[PDB]
C-alpha cells in the first residue's frame, strides 16, 4: 500500500518485475451523501377527537372511534409533556413511530385516582371485574390525564355513574350500558330492591375539593391490532434536500441505488413512477414531492494499469486509469 511499483509485486508474487503493463486493482468513486426522498404527509388523522376532547362519558358507556386509512403521528404524543401517566409493556413508543398496523382503537372515560391499577390484564376488584376489562395479549399503550379543572363541578357531578357490582366475570372489551340487578342468594330480585340485591350504579361525587382518589382522571386506552388484511395506517417520515451531479445514495419509496442525478429530456406518463432499460436497469426516477424526473447515471469506475520498465534499469512507473476522467481522480 505504498508504491504502485510495489503494488505490482504483490499481484505477481515476485521481487523482480520485467517490462510490460499490468493491472493491479480497480478504481471506484465512493459515495459522499445519502439522499432520502419520500412523498408528503398529507391526509392527516383526527387525533384531537379523543385526546383533546371536550365531551366524555362514564366507565361503562365508553364510545369507540375507528382509526384507519390515515397517518399515525406519535411524535407529538410521546413528547406531549402535558399528561399524567404514560406506561406500557414490551414495545417502547419511541420506535413505534415508523411502523404500520391494521386497526387502531381509542376510548374515552374518566376513572378515579385510586382505581388506576385496575386498568391492566390480570387485575381484579371494582372496575376491572364489573365494568370493563382488557385481554392478556394487549400490546397497546395507555394514556391518562388529570381533569381537575375540566370535568369537575361544584356541588357534585351526578350526571355520570359507575358500577359497583355485576353478575359474573365479563368478557374483555365489553360495552355494557344496561342496568341489570345483582343477585347474591336464592332470592331473585325481580327488577326491584329486595333481599341479597345491591344497586351497582353509584353516582359520582366529583368536586374541586376532592381527594386524590376522588378526582376526575381522564384515561384513554389505546390498542393495536395486527390482522391478515394489508396494513392501512402508518407512521410519518422525514426527507432531506436534493443534491445533483454527485454520486450519492438513493432512498426512494420503492427504490435504492447509487449514482448521480442530472436533468432528463424524457417524458413520463402520470400513471408510472420510474423507468427501466432493456436489461432491467433503472435509468430515470420521479421525485415524489415535485413533478420532475431525474436521470440516473452511475459514477465512474474502471481498472488501474501500471506501465513500468524492468526493475534492473529504473523504478519510475506510470499509472493509467482506464475510462476514468482525471477531474475525478484527485
Amino acid at each position: 500500500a505504498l508504491d504502485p511499483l510495489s503494488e505490482t509485486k504483490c499481484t505477481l508474487k515476485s521481487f523482480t518485475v520485467e517490462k510490460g503493463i499490468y493491472q493491479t486493482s480497480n478504481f471506484r468513486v465512493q459515495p459522499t451523501e445519502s439522499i432520502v426522498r419520500f412523498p408528503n404527509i398529507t391526509n392527516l388523522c383526527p387525533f384531537g377527537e379523543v385526546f383533546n376532547a371536550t365531551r366524555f362519558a362514564s366507565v361503562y358507556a365508553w364510545n369507540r372511534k375507528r382509526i384507519s386509512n390515515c397517518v399515525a403521528d406519535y411524535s407529538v404524543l410521546y413528547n406531549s409533556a402535558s399528561f399524567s401517566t404514560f406506561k406500557c409493556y414490551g414495545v417502547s413508543p419511541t420506535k413505534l413511530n415508523d411502523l404500520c398496523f391494521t386497526n387502531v382503537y381509542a376510548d374515552s372515560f374518566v376513572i378515579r385516582g385510586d382505581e388506576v391499577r385496575q386498568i391492566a390484564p390480570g387485575q381484579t376488584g371494582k372496575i376491572a371485574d364489573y365494568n370493563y376489562k382488557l385481554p392478556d395479549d394487549f400490546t397497546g399503550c395507555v394514556i391518562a390525564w388529570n381533569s381537575n379543572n375540566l370535568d369537575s363541578k361544584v356541588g357534585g357531578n351526578y350526571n355520570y355513574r359507575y358500577r359497583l357490582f355485576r353478575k359474573s366475570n365479563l368478557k374483555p372489551f365489553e360495552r355494557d350500558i344496561s342496568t341489570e340487578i345483582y343477585q347474591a342468594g336464592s332470592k331473585p330480585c325481580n327488577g326491584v330492591e329486595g333481599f341479597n340485591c345491591y344497586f351497582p350504579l353509584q353516582s359520582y361525587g366529583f368536586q374541586p375539593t376532592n381527594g386524590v382518589g376522588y378526582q376526575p382522571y381522564r384515561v384513554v386506552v389505546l390498542s393495536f391490532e395486527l390482522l391478515h388484511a394489508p396494513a392501512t395506517v402508518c407512521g410519518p417520515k422525514k426527507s432531506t434536500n436534493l443534491v445533483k451531479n454527485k454520486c450519492v445514495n438513493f432512498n426512494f419509496n420503492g427504490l435504492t441505488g447509487t449514482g448521480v442525478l442530472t436533468e432528463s429530456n424524457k417524458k413520463f406518463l402520470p400513471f408510472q413512477q420510474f423507468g427501466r432499460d432493456i436489461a432491467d436497469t433503472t435509468d430515470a426516477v420521479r421525485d415524489p414531492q415535485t413533478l420532475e424526473i431525474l436521470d440516473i447515471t452511475p459514477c465512474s469506475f474502471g481498472g488501474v494499469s501500471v506501465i513500468t520498465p524492468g526493475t534492473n534499469t529504473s523504478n519510475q512507473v506510470a499509472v493509467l486509469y482506464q475510462g476514468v476522467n482525471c477531474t475525478e481522480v484527485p
Binding site: 436489461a279 436497469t281 452511475p298 469506475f301 474502471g302 481498472g303 482506464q322 475510462g323
Partner: peptide, 22 residues
Amino acid sequence: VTKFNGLTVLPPLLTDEMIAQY
C-alpha cells in the same frame, strides 16, 4: 455493418485510420 454491472469495453490498439494506411 450496424455497461452497468462491472462491464467495460476496451478500445483496440490499431485504430481504423492506421488500418487504412496499411
